[PDB]
Amino acid sequence: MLRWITAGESHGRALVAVVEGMVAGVHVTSADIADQLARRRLGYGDAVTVLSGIRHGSTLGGPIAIEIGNTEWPKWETVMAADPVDPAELADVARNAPLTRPRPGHADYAGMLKYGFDDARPVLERASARETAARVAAGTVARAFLRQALGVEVLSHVISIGASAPYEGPPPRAEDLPAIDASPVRAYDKAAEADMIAQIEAAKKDGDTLGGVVEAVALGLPVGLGSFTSGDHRLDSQLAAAVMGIQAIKGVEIGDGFQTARRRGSRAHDEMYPGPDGVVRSTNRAGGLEGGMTNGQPLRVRAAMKPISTVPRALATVDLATGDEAVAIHQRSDVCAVPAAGVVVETMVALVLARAALEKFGGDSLAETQRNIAAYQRSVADR
Amino acid sequence: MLRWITAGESHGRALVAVVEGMVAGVHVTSADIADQLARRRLGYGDAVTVLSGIRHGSTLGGPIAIEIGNTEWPKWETVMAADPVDPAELADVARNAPLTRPRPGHADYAGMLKYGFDDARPVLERASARETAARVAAGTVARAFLRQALGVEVLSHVISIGASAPYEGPPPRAEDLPAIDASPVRAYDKAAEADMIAQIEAAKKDGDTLGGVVEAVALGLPVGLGSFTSGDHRLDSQLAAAVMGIQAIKGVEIGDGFQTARRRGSRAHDEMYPGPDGVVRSTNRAGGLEGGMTNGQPLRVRAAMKPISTVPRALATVDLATGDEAVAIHQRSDVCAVPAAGVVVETMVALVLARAALEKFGGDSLAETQRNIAAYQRSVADR
Ligand code: NA
Ligand code: NA
Ligand code: NA
Ligand code: NA
Ligand code: NA
Ligand code: NA
């Protein structure tokens, strides 16, 4: 089974992603990884070393380990040293001071209590969204597989930021990605773009921060990934887990999501009609999933992100050392990370889709998986 | 690790739930199970046999197997026979006729293609929401554990059905459950109740069907279930998987969810203040989770359900046998199943919470787990 794991602290030496269970023969390079890491850095308001699992630009079949360096490591090499440091030397280092005032909205408080820590540092170092870089590295392998095996593309666009009027037009196609990635807020629609940029400008002036909604779209999927046989096998379950597990995400929808719940059955679903090469539909309210399976239509997954950067001077907290009232201090200064969150959602979607495809189509090498896919597609067409 | 699995077809002999990894010593009976199954039958518009794992009303520590009979089995005992039946005898049975016209919105089409079936019967039998009965049986064990180990209660109430004005007042407490369960639409609020009942009456008159939004609330949780250490360990990920995997669910939110994404950082989070016995908060926008962990506040999980019963004569489909146009025929006749969906969401929430509690607190018997919980609570209080 395809599996992924990330490791690293925000201010540690490096991050590591390991992907286990990918077939041999998938073409992927350090340059591909770096490119996706560059996309994760997009938005208005990462030295890669492949350590294992890839040879001469082709996966080997074994575990793929990717390291992502921390460029600021020299500043942190004592405070975040793996090995013991003389506590007296450490006592003279201002950077190593105690963080005992948890930020509302973050892991700090619950993580400190959970693990019995008197300092937020060990919590925030691992909880931080810097970890999504390691996710994106892993996701690159999944992306390559999906394209080479299935001709599938995963992209995203931003629906809303702050109080912007949500973009409710049709989703983009793959060929629209260059224009989206060139948008300061990775919007597909120019009117929504302007509205969102205005929201960011206003927040920036007010010294405030914003969240937003993003949509990942996966195109070209075969019918029948996921299953109806149990709750855990439904692809929507799997996608929900992968997307909700992203830092700052507080909601996930498939297709028209919560709006579908307000609609009558007569207008809620996607009717089917005859076509040359199979059943066709004129709507995709379902967002490409029915009964837990891909149905041939674009997969559409939406994620709601809370504002992720803490606001200066606004939020009351408690100094856990004393029990006294305090005010929370920020660790990040960006007004909005929604555009980049879209890229992270793409990654998580790709990983789940790749896993589901390997579950159905099997194989130990790409050529084998491809034969299996072709035979399945033939069997469907011959219906 | 606590694990659950369901088995059964809608018109098979019986359903089975198996729960593995529950501690010995939890008090739970067949009558408790039947009571929760009765709750699953609530809403305006199940013979239980415990086979293993419980002795004299106390769990044994091994796998708990619960069987739920199908009262209509005699009608289906040939059509759904496990063993071969003479195809000629079968050919004279109208009930065994082919279902080759997939219902929009259901598993039928994708499941037929996935598994190479020329009949929807094997798909709809397993995909059907009758399977949620087996979930509720399993969930009863989880509920008992949560109450006995942690004093935790899980309940639900309905937010909206069809185009009703959503209830956005405060959530109920445990002591409100009798009033909610006595409501025809399991609403906490009388004004919202009337609005929802009107929606159902209008749909019923029009020969249409409805979906809706429900909120599960879990009260009394300790701080620090779930973790920030990876995407899969975040409790919101786990809850999202469990809830989105329920039939007909198309969206999941934690706390204020998608609305949080429209708010500024200054008004999006729950500030902390000093209190006698620990940090206190005046808001719960987060819905009881921060950084993937319980934070002490009520857990609030919302689920969006599409309308789940097919509408007579409305939906075009295709006869897969011929390629000809057709109109979809329904398998269920209820206008709205939202109130009951709430009960199923409670179950899935309970199962995930019980699993997370056993992960942190360990133990093989309830008394052992309880000692571990008490010691943790003491250690927190002694901060
Ligand atoms: Na780590
Ligand atoms: Na190959
Ligand atoms: Na679409
Ligand atoms: Na079964
Ligand atoms: Na015990
Ligand atoms: Na609350």
From Swiss-Prot, chains A, B:
Coiled-coil positions: none
UniProt binding sites for NADP(+): R40
Cofactor stoichiometry and binding remark: Reduced FMN (FMNH(2)).
Residues the entry annotates as binding FMN: R126, A127, S128, Q247, A248, G291, K306, P307, I308, S309, T310, R332
Broad enzyme group: lyase
GO MF, one example: chorismate synthase activity
Amino-acid biosynthesis recorded as keyword: yes
A Gene Ontology cellular-component term: cytosol
EC numbers for this chain: 4.2.3.5
GO terms, biological process: amino acid biosynthetic process; aromatic amino acid family biosynthetic process; chorismate biosynthetic process
Reactions catalysed, as given in the entry: 5-O-(1-carboxyvinyl)-3-phosphoshikimate = chorismate + phosphate
Needed co-factor(s): FMNH2
Key words, A-Z: Amino-acid biosynthesis, Aromatic amino acid biosynthesis, FAD, Flavoprotein, FMN, Lyase, NADP
Pathway note: Metabolic intermediate biosynthesis; chorismate biosynthesis; chorismate from D-erythrose 4-phosphate and phosphoenolpyruvate: step 7/7
InterPro entries: Chorismate_synth, Chorismate_synth_AroC_sf, Chorismate_synthase_CS
SUPFAM superfamilies referenced in this protein's UniProt entry, alphabetically: Chorismate synthase, AroC
Superkingdom of source: Bacteria
Record family assignment: Belongs to the chorismate synthase family.
Complexes and interactors: Homotetramer: dimer of dimers.
Function: This reaction introduces a second double bond into the aromatic ring system.
Extra facts: Was identified as a high-confidence drug target.
Protein's UniProt name: Chorismate synthase
Species whose genome carries this gene: Mycobacterium tuberculosis (strain ATCC 25618 / H37Rv)
Organism ancestry: Bacteria, Bacillati, Actinomycetota, Actinomycetes, Mycobacteriales
Gene that produces this protein: aroC
